[PDB]
């Protein structure tokens, strides 16, 4: 089986640089180019240059050269591409690339693909604030409600409502990175309104790289 | 050269004939490889030089195509073929078409929802409005403050297409400062989906 194995997630602070690994086996290493190639969050994929694994010759986008760099130790089949001056929209996942079929280069075989998070953040615990049921978030005899987990740094955090007891209804929404650097999600539920006078509604946002746990009550 | 996709987006019922359409601008083509992608993993290779299947693969997916224009079809389609689909062209790859399951079209419910007053605390306010299970995906948010429009200080986020109902539901957050929120009086996201007649607009006032 062919197979690329790339290093795991990296942190950078703009300015900096990553270096990022391609383990390679099932195959002669030698034989075809290594190609390297970007993802934005919710977007198309992008070419950044191919190399020669014989001799490290090197052929690069006119957008990427002098910010990229591909090398290659031969000896352990492993191949290596070093990006350069990281901006936020370096932000993406990159995957190192190789091609199964003879006398062509294009056709390819994934690695997992390696997030890179371009951020000056450091780890944060999220700040969670209601977002309470009222006139304005009712219709028909529904309401809605939810969570807002803001400023946090890194990914992931897990969103539950009173403990697992409430899932339907219930939408987690996609981290966004903000421009400061820390991700911000929200998380909502719909419910009867008949029930906003009775039924107690906790959150309970837990973010295990800062430790930090926080329920809180959305009341009206 | 340049390949340019369509559909952008796909929606159709599980065992429906499935074509997607690839075109290159330069005209010379005889070799194109086709992605599928699903979300959260690597790429995987479903057909090179036009017509021919990686090993693994069904026989319900075919390629075609000469010159200018190349096709990747689903003979029926299959629950585990929902994904995005990429072709390709030397360094060059299309904008990718993500294939949709559909259901009968459906309105957005639409919420609004004030800074709380802890946030205000912080020094910085946050809107938010909630688009509630709604078919298609595509639906545009405005946000609108004493009815004036506000651009690139809005965020937003969606979710996959949910497994049981087949809607998306959509989160818009609206981001201001404390003393900007406080300076204004009408809050308001104006939603446009094909499911509403005309535009609804949910607001609250400070």
């Known amino acids: 089986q062919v197979q690329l194995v790339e290093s795991g997630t990296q942190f950078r602070r703009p300015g900096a640089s990553v270096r990022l690994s391609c383990e390679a086996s099932?195959?002669?290493?030698?034989?075809?180019?290594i190609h390297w190639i970007r993802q934005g969050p919710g977007q198309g994929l992008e070419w950044m240059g191919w190399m020669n694994p014989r001799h490290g010759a090197v052929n690069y986008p006119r957008r990427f050269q002098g910010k990229v760099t591909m090398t290659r130790d031969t000896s352990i089949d492993t191949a290596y591409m070093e990006l350069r001056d990281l901006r936020s929209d370096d932000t993406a996942m990159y995957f190192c690339?190789?091609?199964?079929?003879?006398?062509?280069?294009?056709?390819?075989?994934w690695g997992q693909g390696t997030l890179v998070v371009v951020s000056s953040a450091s780890t944060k615990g999220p700040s969670v604030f209601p977002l309470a049921p009222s006139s304005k978030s009712t219709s028909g005899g529904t309401a809605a409600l939810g969570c807002l987990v803001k400023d946090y740094f890194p990914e992931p955090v897990t969103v539950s409502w009173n403990s697992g007891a409430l899932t339907s209804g219930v939408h987690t929404f996609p981290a966004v990175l903000q421009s400061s650097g820390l991700y911000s999600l929200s998380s909502v539920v719909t419910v009867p309104s008949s029930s906003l006078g009775t039924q107690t509604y906790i959150c309970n946002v837990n973010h295990k790289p800062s430790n930090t746990k926080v329920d809180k009550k959305v009341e009206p | 050269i340049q390949m340019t996709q369509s559909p952008v987006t796909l929606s159709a019922s599980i065992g429906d004939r499935v074509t997607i359409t690839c075109r290159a601008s330069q005209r010379i083509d005889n070799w194109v490889a086709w992605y599928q992608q699903k979300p959260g993993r690597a790429p995987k290779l479903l057909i090179y030089?036009?017509?021919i299947l990686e090993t693994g693969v069904p026989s319900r997916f075919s390629g075609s195509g000469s010159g200018t224009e190349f096709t990747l079809s689903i003979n029926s389609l299959q629950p585990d073929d929902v994904a995005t689909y990429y072709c390709q062209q030397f360094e060059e790859f299309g904008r990718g078409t993500k294939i949709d399951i559909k259901r009968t079209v459906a309105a957005p419910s639409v919420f609004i929802f004030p800074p709380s007053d802890e946030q205000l605390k912080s020094g910085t306010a946050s809107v938010v409005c909630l688009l509630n299970n709604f078919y298609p995906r595509e639906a545009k948010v405005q946000w609108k403050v004493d009815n004036a429009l506000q651009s690139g200080n809005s965020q937003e986020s969606v979710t996959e297409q949910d497994s049981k109902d087949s809607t998306y539901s959509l989160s818009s957050t609206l981001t201001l400062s404390k003393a900007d929120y406080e300076k204004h009086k009408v809050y308001a996201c104006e939603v446009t989906h094909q499911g509403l007649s005309s535009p609804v607009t949910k607001s609250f006032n400070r």
């Open positions: 030089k036009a017509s």
């Open positions: 099932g195959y002669t290493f030698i034989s075809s180019f």
């Open positions: 690339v190789t091609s199964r079929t003879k006398d062509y280069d294009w056709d390819f075989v």
